[PDB]
Amino acid sequence: MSNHNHITVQFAGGCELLFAKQTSLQLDGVVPTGTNLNGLVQLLKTNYVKERPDLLVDQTGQTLRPGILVLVNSCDAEVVGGMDYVLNDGDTVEFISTLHGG
Structure with a gap:
């Protein structure tokens, strides 16, 4: 149908409200090689x-x-880099809050 790479950006717990209370999102690009x-x-x-x-x-x-x-890709994103994981279409990223604090 239209399964070309696609990005997996979703939330869990109390982070969904940081966008639009959405369960998950998908972005369609062309050449995200120059993106991190x-x-x-x-x-x-x-x-x-x-x-x-x-x-x-x-x-x-x-x-x-x-x-x-x-x-990233159902695996620790901090291990691969944390803030230096280059994209190339067909990536996955999740944000799950745990430490509430104050």
Whole structure:
């Protein structure tokens, strides 16, 4: 039908409200070889970010706070790089908050 790469950007727990209470999203590109994680997140939050944009970011507005567990292709996203995972169409990224704090 139209299964060409496709991006898997979804949320879990209390992070769905950081976009539009959506279960998952898919982006259609052409040549994301020149794109990285920092560019992927900013494209989802800086481009929309319903809730406080400063509530997810770590501090430099480049990465996210430890409370959220980022994973790529059903695997730890921090291991591969954390904030340097280059995209190439057909990637997967998740944001699940755990550390509530205050």
